Amino acid sequence: AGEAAYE
């Protein structure tokens, strides 16, 4: 799924 910044 990985990682991301807040959105």
Add this chain to the structure above:
Amino acid sequence: HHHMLHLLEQIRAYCETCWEWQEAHNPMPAPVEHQICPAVCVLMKLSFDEEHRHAMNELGGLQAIAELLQVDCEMYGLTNDHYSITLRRYAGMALTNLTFGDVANKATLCSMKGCMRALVAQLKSESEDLQQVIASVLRNLSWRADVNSKKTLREVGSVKALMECALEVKKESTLKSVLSALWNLSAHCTENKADICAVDGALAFLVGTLTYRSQTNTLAIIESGGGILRNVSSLIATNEDHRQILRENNCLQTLLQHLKSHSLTIVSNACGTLWNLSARNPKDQEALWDMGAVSMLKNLIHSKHKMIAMGSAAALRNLMANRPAKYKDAN
């Protein structure tokens, strides 16, 4: 950077006063009386900028914001006011931004067991928006987690809490963050996989995500829902009750339809799931034969994508070695 330095000092001072009140056992500190909400709001906003993040890390911004979220949760729990809800939302967003790609920050936060427990508890907040924020934190923490972090994520009960959370969310934004975290967690170990499958309604729910109809023209829910399912399908293959849940929510036909997706993620997930579910069970094998699975999987065996190539080939072998009695010209 001395604006940042000032706000972090505000937060540390406030935490120290909360820690003193806790250790006493002076009225109970109230974040409103120390203008905490604005301070974390500003830090949260700076945390989106790459340069500001690096400044923030020199000052132990991650540690301090995590300490604040932790102490407020311990003090006021889920029987807290909107000021507190808000504070935790803005702190949580900052933690998401600060953990993104950051080996040191993920390790620190996962080592804060009290904070980790506090985070997981927030998945039952009355604010579904706060649930999304916390699930975003857990997603980053569970991505490329070291051995200690994997251990803490599991032992604080994040998997059962996220799966349970998923069953209750209304908004697609919340579901995406929650399912992304679960997809990451589902790969860590076999206990995480079992914990997902043990939640009543989870397997049917996950099957439902495979045909999710996104309003925002994206495949994110299908990819994560299908990724979770591929990861737990190793155990589903051992449990007749769990296989039956998949069958009677039309899982098999949908997985065959996923083999045509433009998303290599969707195709790989489906191949992995078909690999495990095509093993042993003659009735699942026959169902797949009848739906044309053999020619569909044969079309993918020359993929450059290693998991699609191996999964499609493995599934195909399971079917080819167990041609149903009825196919044998007949009888």
